[PDB]
Curated annotation (Swiss-Prot), chains A, B:
Name of the protein described by the UniProt record: Plectin
Domain-related comment: The N-terminus interacts with actin, the C-terminus with vimentin, desmin, GFAP, cytokeratins, lamin B; whereas both the N- and the C-terminus can bind integrin beta-4.
Domain Calponin-homology (CH) positions: 6-114, 127-232
Gene name as annotated: Plec
Tissues of expression: Detected in eye lens fiber cells (at protein level). Expressed at high levels in lung, brain, small intestine, muscle, heart and skin with lower levels found in kidney, liver, uterus, spleen and salivary gland.
Annotated spans, Actin-binding: 2-232
Whole-protein residues included: 181 to 411 of 4691
Protein modification: Phosphorylated by CDK1; regulates dissociation from intermediate filaments during mitosis.
Record-stated family: Belongs to the plakin or cytolinker family.
Subcellular location: Cytoplasm, Cytoskeleton; Cell junction, Hemidesmosome; Cell projection, Podosome
Quaternary state and interactors: Homodimer or homotetramer. Interacts (via actin-binding domain) with SYNE3. Interacts (via calponin-homology (CH) 1 domain) with VIM (via rod region). Interacts (via N-terminus) with DST isoform 2 (via N-terminus). Interacts with FER. Interacts with TOR1A. Interacts with ANK3. Identified in complexes that contain VIM, EZR, AHNAK, BFSP1, BFSP2, ANK2, PLEC, PRX and spectrin.
Record organism: Mus musculus (Mouse)
Its biological purpose: Interlinks intermediate filaments with microtubules and microfilaments and anchors intermediate filaments to desmosomes or hemidesmosomes. May be involved not only in the cross-linking and stabilization of cytoskeletal intermediate filaments network, but also in the regulation of their dynamics.
Length: 232, 232
């Protein structure tokens, strides 16, 4: 048991749910309760992809295993036709609720549709999307006294970076002096509540899951990438 | 002027020189004095590729510009023929001694022949070569108290990671308690000396070029990759 897999699942669940409610068809606006059950018939996975891309996709409405395997295949074929690299995931794995491969698939979707469009001044061309986001993060908190961004895990635990990023962007929203004397939990909660109320950024993370010696990397990157998106 | 470019040139020169002396024809066992002069005629570049690949390659012996440009074309064609992504390099650039494009070429060679070989359990497959090497480095230093590997620059500055990677494989060679007590210069000297004496790892880096606020990334990745090769 690694608690980061729990956090990751929660974060991806909130991410998927944020998208499904934006669907234009009212019957597609569903809510994931358990990420390892509610994608098994492929319907929410096809809906997710319709919202992220703006395309319509075909789907089967029958209820046998054959229909679920096919809905999943439609989704994975869609992704393949957009040159996403899906390796070692087959339709049965998703239809059957395999935890690790379901998490792998959603990460693949987040990476392809949200993270891999990032553009930062000072970009090398051999830089990875992750590297570009870390560079963006480092540039955003450059003026600020105690602060370093070394990674997407431990650097973020104390909530100061999240606050500093939002401050840089709109100094009105954040009292930095106060950040320097508040606890981790207070700083995290303050940054997440401001980002949601004032920037439109869905709360993907709970402070209790970030204030931990080894936070889940993909969850942090997903949230940080969602802040980047909220800044013109 | 960025001092890292000086370090990178020095690192790459030592890396090229370590290979040229392993050529099977004695006449090809040459020594690079200045990397921006001594590849211009193409002979050393063809020899390097011969030793890294095991293949014999054609070569021109004349001394006009025509011969130099052709020797260089033979090398770059060989590389294209092996599906190496060269972009923005011609003939002329290497024959004229272009510093940036000469460094870029050698980096492309190091990356294709030495670094892209890495394998460690629990890779993704969307994972880049550098990401695999970083994962390896993170794993190798997991048991060690206050050590973290976040990148291939500032994490390596103090010499502790080099000393830990070696201790993990040969615990008798280094005293980790002395490591936490020493200066960066001592730690780096000791790790590179031990690596060379007992593990056959050529010293590509001098301590004073690593113990700096911003170490050259490609130089460190080159050396770390050399450490990986000298393990089981």
């Amino acid at each position: 048991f690694d608690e980061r897999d729990r956090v990751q699942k929660k974060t991806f669940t909130k991410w998927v749910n944020k998208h499904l409610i934006k669907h234009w068809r009212a019957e597609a606006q569903r809510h994931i309760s358990d990420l390892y059950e509610d994608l098994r018939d492929g319907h929410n996975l096809i809906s997710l992809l319709e919202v992220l891309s703006g395309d319509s996709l075909p789907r089967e409405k029958g209820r046998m295993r054959f229909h679920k395997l096919q809905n999943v295949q439609i989704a994975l074929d869609y992704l393949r036709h957009r040159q996403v690299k899906l390796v070692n995931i087959r339709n049965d794995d998703i239809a059957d609720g395999n935890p690790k491969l379901t998490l792998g698939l959603i990460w693949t979707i987040i990476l392809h549709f949200q993270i891999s469009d990032i553009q930062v001044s000072g970009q090398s061309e051999d830089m990875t999307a992750k590297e570009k986001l870390l560079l963006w993060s480092q540039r955003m908190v450059e003026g600020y006294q105690g602060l370093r961004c070394d990674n997407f895990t431990t650097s973020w635990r104390d909530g100061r970076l999240f606050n500093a990023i939002i401050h840089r962007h709109k100094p009105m929203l954040i009292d930095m002096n106060k950040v320097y004397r508040q606890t981790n939990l207070e700083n995290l909660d303050q940054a997440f509540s401001v980002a949601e109320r004032d920037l439109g950024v869905t709360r993907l993370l709970d402070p209790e899951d970030v204030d931990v010696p080894q936070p889940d990397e993909k969850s942090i990157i997903t949230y940080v990438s969602s802040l980047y998106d909220a800044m013109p």
